[PDB]
């Protein structure tokens, strides 16, 4: 079967860590002989009161804890890295795998190690959207918890949780500390870009084809070209297609397997618009971007 | 609103490789024993099981622990059910508290699907009420489990077996009985007819009236006593509303949310039969409301 597919968890739940901070608790992740956090655990500053903030900050003040180690662990140096805090152990994690911080571009996926008080309570799925927003699943405390992909025994980390918008949006930064998009740490009423469905992550989404139905009754007889869906797109809320010249070897792939060329997905893409009526396509109610080519042609 | 899965690091460090006479599939290691299918040691039928089991030499299953890099040596064998318990001589350090639990149709669990004994992926399941679940596996991800956590507590609810024609997968739970009448043999067998569970479909629609769009235009305009759908359903292939009493409480929590009441969802769910002319209940009530 075709299903959504989570990198397995338990390399990233024993390098969790809970921080707390003057009555401010969050999670952080434990690499080497650093643990990374976001910065807001100390406070809820603005602008350019973190630099200074940060080198007031009493190294004592925070209370790092390794919950399946069952170690604590003390802080020596602490050091602002963009929107994270870098804070300098006396131990080095022996858990710690192969890794490499790895920025994610819009349409793509990772796994979400959601953890409250240092301990990973759930895992799901999601992909960058081009607002440069995740469409997650966050309570109170889940900042540091970390979005990531597996490749052999690298750990790929790509995402550190920061700030939950008023339309249950969730953003925040790289490992390095840069934020996706253009949102930052603060209590702020911050603009958002309109929403754009990632053309083709709905394209994988629509090859249901290949588990559910070879030949429903939504899909399109007729087809459109590429350039013609390009033209419609720019007035629907569609990006161009395709969004990612790698992506069209995979779609092509299941072209094949489907034996339905894109064409004929992306005029059924038009033509659901107006047409769905509340038809179920692989699971799902509406277009999704979970979906990835890769993903879906790969497994 | 997510599909919320369970982490798999406490099963990632019990899983183990079973190899028998070239037969390669998966076990879990508890305590000192190793659980794993039994057809790793042919291709029998019936009650063939139990005689060729007592002949099967404990030397021939190499079983190894591969994220402790550990290999176990098997002192004695013992099928439970369709399930081989391999008595090794180490206790597993890693073994957490757990509980062997049988699933109920419409109840989700988390597959850790396994090859040579690591885990590759991870996804969701709901056992269906053709009590087959729609999952994906390769040859050699026999020994796969599905699990629940309930804080550091594994429950262990299936263990991976064969896979039908429809991609339909079938198992035992961990006491070695199957879900449904479905055995180890490399034979035509026959299914249950497929049968909505209707507590997860409606709160798959309660999950997109909270998320996407409250207030659809296929939403219906009217409602359907629980009574009348419960007529529909039994000619629809729709399971009798409410499928488990325990859903109720979490289902009228989301109807007040949504401020849609389930009689309008319900006639909803009637409505879409011409769209439907699947995957359609792996919402359940409670990851829905709780999260
Ligand atoms: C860190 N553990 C939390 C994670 C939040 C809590 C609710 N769901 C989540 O994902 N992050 C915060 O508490 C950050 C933190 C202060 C406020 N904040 C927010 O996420 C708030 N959002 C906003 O202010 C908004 F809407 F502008 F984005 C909150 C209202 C609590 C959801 C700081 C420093 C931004
Ligand atoms: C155990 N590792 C595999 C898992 C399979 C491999 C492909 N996808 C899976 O889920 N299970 C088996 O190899 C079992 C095993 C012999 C045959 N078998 C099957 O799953 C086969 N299916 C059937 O026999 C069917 F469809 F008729 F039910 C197979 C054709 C290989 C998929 C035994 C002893 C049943």
Same mark, same amino acid.
């Given at each position: ?32 002989? /650093? ?11 603005? *602008? ?97 918890? /970390? *979005? ?23 953003? *925040? ?38 588990? /559910? ?69 692989? *699971? ?16």
């Amino acid at each position: 079967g075709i299903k959504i597919l989570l990198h397995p968890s338990g390399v990233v739940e024993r390098c969790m860590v809970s921080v707390v901070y003057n009555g401010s608790a969050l999670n952080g992740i434990w690499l080497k002989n /650093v643990v990374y956090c976001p910065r807001h655990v100390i406070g809820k500053f603005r *602008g350019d009161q973190w630099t200074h903030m940060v080198s007031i900050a009493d190294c004592r003040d925070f209370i790092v804890k390794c919950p399946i180690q069952g170690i604590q662990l003390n802080v020596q140096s602490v050091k602002m890295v963009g929107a994270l805090l870098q804070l300098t152990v006396h131990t080095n994690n022996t858990a710690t795998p192969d890794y490499k911080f790895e920025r994610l571009q819009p349409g793509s996926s990772m796994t979400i190690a959601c953890a409250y008080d240092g301990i990973v309570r759930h895992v799901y799925h999601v992909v960058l959207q081009l607002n440069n927003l995740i469409y997650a699943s966050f309570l109170n405390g889940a900042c540091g918890s /970390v *979005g990531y992909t597996l490749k052999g025994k690298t750990l790929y980390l790509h995402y550190m949780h920061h700030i939950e918008f008023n339309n249950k949006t969730h953003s *925040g930064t790289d490992l390095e500390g840069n934020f996706y998009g253009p949102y930052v740490d603060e209590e702020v009423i911050q603009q958002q870009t309109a929403f754009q469905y990632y053309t083709d992550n709905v394209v994988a989404q629509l090859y249901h084809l290949l588990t /559910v139905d070879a030949r429903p009754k939504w899909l399109a007889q007729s087809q459109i070209s590429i350039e013609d869906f390009n033209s419609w797109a720019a007035n629907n809320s569609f990006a161009n297609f395709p969004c990612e010249q790698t992506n069209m070897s995979y779609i092509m792939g299941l072209s094949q397997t489907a034996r339905v060329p894109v064409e004929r997905i992306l005029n059924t893409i038009i033509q659901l618009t107006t047409n769905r009526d509340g038809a179920c396509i692989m *699971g799902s109610y509406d277009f999704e971007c979970d979906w990835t080519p890769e993903m879906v042609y790969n497994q």
